[PDB]
Nucleic acid binder design. Structure first.
Lengths: 117, 110, 26, 142, 150, 56
RNA sequence: GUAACGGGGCUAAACCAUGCACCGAAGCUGCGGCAGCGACGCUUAUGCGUUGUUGGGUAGGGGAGCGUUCUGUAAGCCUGCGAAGGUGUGCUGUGAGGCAUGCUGGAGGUAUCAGAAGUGCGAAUGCUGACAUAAGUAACGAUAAAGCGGGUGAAAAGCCC
RNA sequence: CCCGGCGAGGGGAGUGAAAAAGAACCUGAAACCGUGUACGUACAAGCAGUGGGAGCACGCUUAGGCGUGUGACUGCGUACC
């Protein structure tokens, strides 16, 4: 029962070189190099699904701050204002509203200003 | 009307024929030959016969009018390496590859 | 041809030591 | 859906004059740095330049507290042998007063291609005017 | 592996990997780390486990209507064609025949018929009783199989 | 006197960026015989600047 | 080479003392998903189902699976209306993978259910074969020594005269 | 029948089911070497990846911010055994 390996080994290597398309030099041509590149791609990919959720919130916060200060209040007080007014609109939605409807956002600044005074 | 001619197994490395191949790519065939005639390279001799072979392919088989042809494609590929041995010092033997090349030249009236 | 096969090749092997040079040396 | 993003082939970037007279050095360079980044625009976007163009006259008249006028030292190397050259704040004002405001903001701006691109929009003069009168800059108390 | 046991080249000083034998199984030629011998693949079966097994299969044959009993089963002249006619008439095709005595005419007539085999009761085996669609036994054949398993 | 790492094919190509040849372009025509020729050289028929030099 | 706040920078943007506000992890909460265990004990070989709780892993211990080569059901079926291989697409599996086909290719091909193993490589300065690199880089092997005119010859520094 | 040194190599025709089955002849992988189109790059510094992510080019997204290619800027990031 002699087993020749050529057919199975090609299929296994081809899967890897396929995952490595777009990489530079040997990393998209040479199995040994590609294999290390594809794993590391996976390592980073896992990690940055966690990181992605961090980066977006920092962006929303940063934008609300600018728009809050435009209506004459700091981020820290505006959020506190909304909490004591029991407004629960999150920062994804608030940063969206900060950009596309400045008049609705100003109305949320008053809502949060009334509660805070 | 693409027309091909080739010198296969030319006795020159692909690298060396390429410097000369590059001089005539995209040119009128009349203009190309003059360039080749006064290029001081062994490789000028090899490809020129091929271009002229290609010119004759164009007249005799179909195409014709020497005026209308341009060197629309030209590429030089690697031929077989002949394996040989050179004695060096202290009983050590080195490989020499006597490299060859596949010279392809394409011409068309359009 | 065009036999194309002159070479054996039977490539030679050198041995063993021409140079033993130091040193650390002790 | 996805979040807004500034597009460099749409963004507006406005023009401002700022008087640096009597202003504390790096306590003003902060607001320039901040504004050259567009941190004050709700449409702020960290990879895009949504900042504004800022003229700064009377850089020779910017203030520093305590003994910094004489003791504060600027070092630079020339990539040579000894290299380490030296000069005080007062000496910088003397030689080229523009440099003090420039070096301040530069070190507060993000470092990198875009970083170096925001700096380009800072237009510091020593004198009390500029050639950018056609740019119709509006006065800024910063 | 045929060849000699000279070290192909030293324990030290040459830039190459250490070698000892041109017949090392890592080497081209003369591999086979764990070479095969002729071996006996047979297994023991308990007398009782064999008989117990025959009985279970035979009992299933009854239940699946694959076992066919007759008074007599024989043929006249040793002509496969003669048998062929008979088998069609009985509506049988893929079948094992087990007879009372090793009947020779029947034995000869069946040899070239691929879907038919003939057997005396003494010579039965487990896999044949399974390998055919139907199984035919003579009255005599039953009595002999019965005594054997009992 | 040796590389620590294998240089790339890209770098090889950059090194070759000045290996390209120059075309002459500067053939001229003898006024008498009408042949092209390298400037300041005689022609194949042994003509030069309109006068029959040599003879071959 | 400042260089013993990380840097700009700070009379306070430094300590000390009270106070309130926010950011902040893969922590905890939410919604969506996959798994392993016990206790109710419907069912009641069981298959389920509600709840309770666990799912960082080196050596190693246990429990599951994929895939190739081969023997059996295997004169069982798909085949020239195109097999395996190759090279391409399409979907779905939690993964080994799997299924769906476009073009070369031009003979073979094999559900399921069994069984046996020359059973699954990237590292052993592992063995053989191709092909890179440095690189069109170093060298062309007495520092005795050549220069013209003819010749033949597709073409002469090396070949005759 | 041509180009071609009465050359090697071609290009035609013809044989051939098919010569990209034509004597380094079944099929015919990658390394490696080539030509052709698309996008990117000469002020920008680092296990070259991944998270964002402007612009351009295709396939209409075949009316709807859809598939692919490329992908400036920026955030996280010291290969394996």
């Amino acid at each position: 029962a002699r087993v020749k390996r050529g057919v199975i080994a090609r299929a296994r290597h081809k899967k890897i070189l396929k995952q490595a398309k777009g990489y530079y030099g040997a990393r998209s041509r040479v199995y040994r190099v590609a294999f290390q590149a594809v794993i590391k791609a996976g390592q980073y990919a896992y990690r940055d699904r966690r990181q992605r959720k961090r980066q977006f919130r920092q962006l929303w916060i940063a934008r609300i701050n600018a728009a809050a200060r435009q209506n004459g209040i700091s981020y820290s007080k505006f959020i506190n204002g909304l909490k004591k007014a029991s407004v629960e609109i999150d920062r994804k939605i608030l940063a969206d509203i900060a950009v596309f409807d400045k008049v609705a956002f100003t109305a949320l600044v008053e809502k949060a200003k009334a509660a805070l005074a | 009307m693409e027309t091909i001619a080739k010198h296969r197994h030319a006795r020159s490395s692909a690298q060396k024929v390429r410097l000369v191949a590059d001089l005539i790519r995209g040119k009128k065939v009349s203009q190309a030959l003059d360039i080749l005639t006064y290029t001081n390279k062994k490789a000028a001799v090899l490809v020129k016969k091929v271009l002229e072979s290609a010119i004759a392919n164009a007249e005799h088989n179909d195409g014709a009018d020497i005026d209308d042809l341009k060197v629309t494609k030209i590429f030089v590929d690697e031929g077989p390496s002949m394996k040989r041995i050179m004695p060096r010092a202290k009983g050590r033997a080195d490989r020499i590859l006597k490299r060859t090349s596949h010279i392809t030249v394409v011409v068309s009236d359009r | 041809e065009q036999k194309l096969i002159s070479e054996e090749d039977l490539f030679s092997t050198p041995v063993w030591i021409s140079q033993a040079q130091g040193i650390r040396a002790g | 859906m996805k979040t807004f993003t500034a597009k460099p082939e749409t963004v507006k970037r406005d023009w401002y004059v700022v008087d640096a007279t009597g202003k504390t050095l790096g306590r003003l360079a902060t607001e320039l740095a901040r504004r050259l980044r567009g941190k004050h625009k709700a449409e702020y976007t960290p990879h895009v330049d949504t900042g504004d163009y800022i003229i700064v006259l009377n850089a020779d008249k910017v203030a520093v507290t305590g003994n910094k006028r004489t003791d504060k030292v600027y070092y630079h190397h020339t990539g040579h042998i000894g290299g380490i050259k030296q000069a005080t704040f007062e000496e910088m004002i003397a030689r080229r007063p523009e440099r003090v405001i420039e070096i301040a903001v530069k070190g507060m701006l993000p470092k990198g291609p875009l970083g170096r691109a925001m700096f380009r929009k800072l237009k510091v003069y020593a004198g009390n005017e500029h050639n950018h009168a056609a740019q119709q800059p509006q006065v800024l108390d910063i | 592996v045929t060849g000699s046991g000279k070290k192909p080249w030293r324990q030290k000083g040459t830039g190459r990997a250490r070698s000892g034998s041109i017949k090392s199984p890592i080497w081209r030629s003369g591999g086979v780390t764990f070479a095969a011998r002729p071996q006996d693949h047979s297994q023991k079966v308990n007398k009782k486990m064999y008989r117990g097994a025959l009985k279970s299969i035979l009992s299933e044959l009854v239940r699946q209507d694959r076992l066919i009993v007759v008074e007599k089963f024989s043929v006249e002249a040793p002509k496969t064609k003669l048998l062929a006619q008979k088998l069609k008439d009985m509506a049988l095709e893929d079948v094992l025949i087990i007879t009372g005595e090793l009947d020779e005419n029947l034995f000869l007539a069946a040899r070239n018929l691929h879907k038919v085999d003939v057997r005396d009761a003494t010579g039965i085996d487990p896999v044949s009783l399974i390998a055919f669609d139907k199984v035919v036994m003579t009255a005599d054949a039953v009595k002999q199989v019965e005594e054997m398993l009992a | 006197a040796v590389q620590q790492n294998k240089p790339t094919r890209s770098k090889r190509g950059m090194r070759r960026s000045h290996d390209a040849l120059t075309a002459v372009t500067s053939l001229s025509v003898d006024k008498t015989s009408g042949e092209k020729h390298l400037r300041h050289h005689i022609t194949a028929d042994g003509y030069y600047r309109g006068r029959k030099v040599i003879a071959k």
